[PDB]
Amino acid sequence: SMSVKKPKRDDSKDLALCSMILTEMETHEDAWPFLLPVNLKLVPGYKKVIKKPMDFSTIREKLSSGQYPNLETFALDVRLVFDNCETFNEDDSDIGRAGHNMRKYFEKKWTDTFK
C-alpha cells in the first residue's frame, strides 16, 4: 500500500530473456503455423471467430518496440497464440498437435527461466 512495498524483484533482464524464449519458439520445427498472421482474406471463418489474432511475428514486433509493459503481458500474447489455435483447429490435425506441442515447450521454458 502507500509507502509499504514488497522487496524489488529484479526485472532488468526480462526483455532479453523473453527475446530468447521467443527465438527458441520461432526456431522450433512445429512453429510453422504460428510464424505469421493468419491471412484473413484466405481463411474462411478466422476473422469472425478469432476475436484477437496473435502470431510470433506480431509478438516479436511488439517486444522490439516496447509494447509489453511487463513479462506477464508477453506470456498472455504467447498463450493467446495457442488458445486461438485450439479454438480453430481439431486436436487431431497437424496444426492442432503443433499448438499443443508449442504450448508445452513454451510453458517449460517459462517456468525454467522465471519460476
Curated annotation (Swiss-Prot):
Q: In which tissues is it expressed?
A: Expressed at varying levels in several tissues, whereas a smaller transcript was expressed specifically in testis.
Tell me where it resides.
Answer: Nucleus
Lineage, top-rank taxon, reads Eukaryota
Which positions fall inside the Bromo domain? 9-113
- Quaternary state and partners of this protein? Component of the BRF-1 ISWI chromatin remodeling complex, at least composed of SMARCA1 and BAZ2B, which regulates the spacing of histone octamers on the DNA template to facilitate access to DNA. Within the BRF-1 ISWI chromatin remodeling complex interacts with SMARCA1; the interaction is direct. Component of the BRF-5 ISWI chromatin remodeling complex, at least composed of SMARCA5/SNF2H and BAZ2B, which regulates the spacing of histone octamers on the DNA template to facilitate access to DNA.
Tell me, in a sentence or two, what this protein's role is. Answer: Regulatory subunit of the ATP-dependent BRF-1 and BRF-5 ISWI chromatin remodeling complexes, which form ordered nucleosome arrays on chromatin and facilitate access to DNA during DNA-templated processes such as DNA replication, transcription, and repair. Both complexes regulate the spacing of nucleosomes along the chromatin and have the ability to slide mononucleosomes to the center of a DNA template. The BRF-1 ISWI chromatin remodeling complex has a lower ATP hydrolysis rate than the BRF-5 ISWI chromatin remodeling complex.
> What's the family?
Belongs to the WAL family.
Name of the featured protein: Bromodomain adjacent to zinc finger domain protein 2B
Upper classification of the source organism reads: Eukaryota, Metazoa, Chordata, Craniata, Vertebrata
Complete-protein stretch covered: 2054 to 2166 of 2168
